[PDB]
């Protein structure tokens, strides 16, 4: 129970902490949201394919230009820990996607929960544009009632049939991502240590 990651859901972080986390998060969803595509037809995830209601990809692409300029593709960083999420992400999305169910949960709902509360607070605490620009990872133009979208994603996790030997791997996998997430906002806290 540390700090950095938390001082994030607030509106704390300097900004190069934000940018950082952003580029870290742009590197998580790409893989994620593409591997999710790689499996947009299998029973063990099929009921959770909501492309236009959650996907964060393009929004961060719209942001990674507001944070790192035009030459953002090759200018944006890719820390080693960011590289470790992406891997257990690729590793799952191609040969064991029944735990892929765990990632979309750790992410989206882990990211969503607090809707216009890290957008309607982050930009009013960073001299950011009021139209939303920059904080696009925090806006979902396809969710009228997000707390209700939750009933609809969690409920879709109920149609997901799976034996017990798997339901044990889906859960231990989420911890993995619960572990993979923390390790990030910790390296992103320590990666800042020496930066004049």
CATH code: domain of residue 38: 1.20.910.10
Residues making up the annotated binding site for heme b are 105, 154
All residues at 6 or more sequence positions from 89 whose CB lies less than 8 Å from its CB, including other chains: 28, 31, 32, 35, 103
Q: Which of 7, 48, 28, 14 is nearest to 127 (CA)?
A: 14
Q: How many domains does the structure of the chain reveal?
A: 1
Q: Which resolution, in Å, applies to this structure?
A: 2.5
Q: How far apart, in whole angstroms, are the C-alpha atoms of residue 138 and residue 116?
A: 7
Between the alpha carbon of residue 136 and those of residues 35, 54, 111, 115, 153, the distances in Å are 21, 12, 12, 11, 21
Angle between the 57-68 and 16-38 helix axes, to the nearest 10 degrees? 150
Q: Which of 93, 112, 106 is nearest to 42 (CA)?
A: 93
Residues making up the annotated binding site are 105, 154
Contact status, residue 48 vs residue 101, Cβ threshold 8 Å: yes
Q: How far apart, in whole angstroms, are the C-alpha atoms of residue 56 and residue 43?
A: 23
DSSP for 164-177, written as a single string: HHHHHHHHHHHHHH
Asked how this structure was determined, the answer is: X-ray
Q: How far apart, in whole angstroms, are the C-alpha atoms of residue 89 and residue 36?
A: 10
The domain in which residue 95 lies consists of: 1-196
Contact status, residue 160 vs residue 47, Cβ threshold 8 Å: yes
């Amino acid at each position: 129970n540390s700090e950095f990651m938390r001082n994030f859901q607030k509106g704390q972080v300097s900004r190069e902490g934000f940018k950082l986390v952003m580029a870290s998060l742009y590197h998580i969803y790409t893989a994620l949201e593409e591997e999710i595509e790689r499996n947009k037809q299998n029973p063990v995830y099929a009921p959770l394919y909501f492309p236009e209601e959650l996907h964060r990809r393009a929004a961060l692409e719209q942001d990674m230009a507001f944070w790192y300029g035009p030459h953002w593709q090759e200018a944006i960083p890719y820390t080693p820990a960011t590289q470790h999420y992406v891997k257990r992400l690729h590793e799952v999305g191609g040969t064991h996607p029944e735990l892929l169910v765990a990632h979309a949960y750790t992410r989206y709902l882990g990211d969503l929960s607090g809707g216009q509360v890290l957008k309607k607070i982050a930009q009013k605490a960073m001299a950011l544009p009021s139209s939303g620009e920059g904080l696009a990872f925090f806006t979902f133009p396809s969710i009228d009632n997000p707390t209700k979208f939750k009933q609809l994603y969690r409920a879709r996790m109920n149609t997901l049939e799976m034996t017990p030997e798997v339901k044990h791997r889906v859960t231990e996998e989420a911890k993995t991502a619960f572990l993979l997430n923390i390790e990030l906002f910790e390296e992103l806290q320590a990666l800042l240590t020496e930066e004049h």
